Amino acid sequence: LKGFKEFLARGNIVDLAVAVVIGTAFTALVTKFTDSIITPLINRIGVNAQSDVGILRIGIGGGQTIDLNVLLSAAINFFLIAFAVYFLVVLPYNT
Amino acid sequence: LKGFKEFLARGNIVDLAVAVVIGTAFTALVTKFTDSIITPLINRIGVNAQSDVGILRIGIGGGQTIDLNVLLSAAINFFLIAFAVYFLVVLPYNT
Amino acid sequence: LKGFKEFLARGNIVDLAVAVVIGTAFTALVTKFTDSIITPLINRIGVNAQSDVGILRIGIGGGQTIDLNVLLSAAINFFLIAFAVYFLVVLPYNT
Amino acid sequence: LKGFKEFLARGNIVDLAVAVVIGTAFTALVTKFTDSIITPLINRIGVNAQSDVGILRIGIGGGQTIDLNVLLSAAINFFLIAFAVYFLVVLPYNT
Amino acid sequence: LKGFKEFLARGNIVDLAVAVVIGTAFTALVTKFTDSIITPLINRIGVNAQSDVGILRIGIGGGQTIDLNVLLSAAINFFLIAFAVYFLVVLPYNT
């Protein structure tokens, strides 16, 4: 048990490994928040995806989509991350 | 060996590259748990996702889901990462 | 709320853990900017991927694709991340 | 070329970015080893996840699987990243 | 306007968050080159999916797979992450 446990507490490895444990975790509470709740409110939009033809010589030549409104949800991803975390850092810490 | 091994041991490229190797590995364990186990208990819930009528100008007109309960399985994703790391990594360090 | 929200703010666990909240959340606005808008414009290219005849022991032995231009949309992926990170973040900081 | 190739050698960007270039790169060799070689021996466990009768008010009424295979595979996702980083990076460094 | 683009620039976040921007985007370009130029050549090899038998008592029991050269589709990006970075980022820096 010595090799793994006692090397843990040193230096910046505990400041960081658990910190990218916070970067991926919280931004999933809040991204999967965007894209499950809101991106369907952004999938009711639909006006996008003006038809496109790409004739692949391997035979995919019916049509394609140039679909824009998930870019609209890509800001719903970033902003509400940057809203769910912007509230919690400013209130107890930034002051 | 010289170009790689010698410039292996330096600086933060270990405390910081290996530390985003603890981030993914521990949060590819516990997140892959959250949806292996809990989300289909939350997907047993199901009563979510009242339909969302989005008529694409490309021609998909059946229907869409404003699909909630994987959001509920994202709080399950942020919370239960923050407890499995609160005991293995925090209880023998913070104490 | 005490042991949690006040161990919140000490050291590099705020600067680093949310900089990867900014690592994933910022690029997702601009990566998905390049994949909903551009990669479909790069699906109009379509030329690349002359077939590959490759069998498996399961048995898939019809045809493969040796497909390039998403390499040519992965490059559009790295570049505009660099442009969008250079404008809102670096242009007010490099000054 | 001066704004790019002289702001790079400053501070910790080289030690920190190339690091998360190491972080994701290395576990991309190890987590996929987990899930390509082993996770499908873990789907050879087979008997997991007795059907989960979940009533959706919206249209799915046949069954739900809650597969513990991929949790036990996530245990193969965190244990096996630990060995690959301990042998190539730590044995000549911890010594 | 102010509190955003002026608290933006302080400390290491314009390093760190843009440095993990470097960790997200660079590995993605080299890995999709690895996934699009190369997967074809690698799915021509067919080392993957050696037939296996895993009895789901929940009803997938026809034939299974144990993917071996998806391990071989992964080594190609980890090393090429370590090869594409060495020419663009390292050779004018290590000098």
Author numbering:
A (entry chain C), B (entry chain D), C (entry chain B), D (entry chain E), E (entry chain A): 2 to 96
Task: Reproduce text from the manuscript describing this model.
MS channels are widely distributed through all kingdoms of life, including bacteria and archaea, where they play a prominent role in maintaining proper osmoregulation. Sudden changes in osmolarity, such as osmotic downshock during exposure to hypotonic conditions, increases turgor pressure across the cell membrane. This in turn increases the tension within the lipid bilayer and activates a network of MS channels which respond by opening typically nonselective pores in the membrane to release cell contents and alleviate the pressure. The first crystal structure determination of MscL was obtained for the Mycobacterium tuberculosis homolog (MtMscL), solved to 3.5 Å resolution. This structure revealed a pentameric channel with a relatively simple subunit architecture consisting of a cytoplasmic N-terminal amphipathic helix, two transmembrane helices (TM1 and TM2) connected by a periplasmic loop, and a cytoplasmic C-terminal helix. The assembled channel can be considered to be composed of two major elements: the membrane spanning region that forms the high conductance permeation pathway in the open state, and the C-terminal cytoplasmic region.
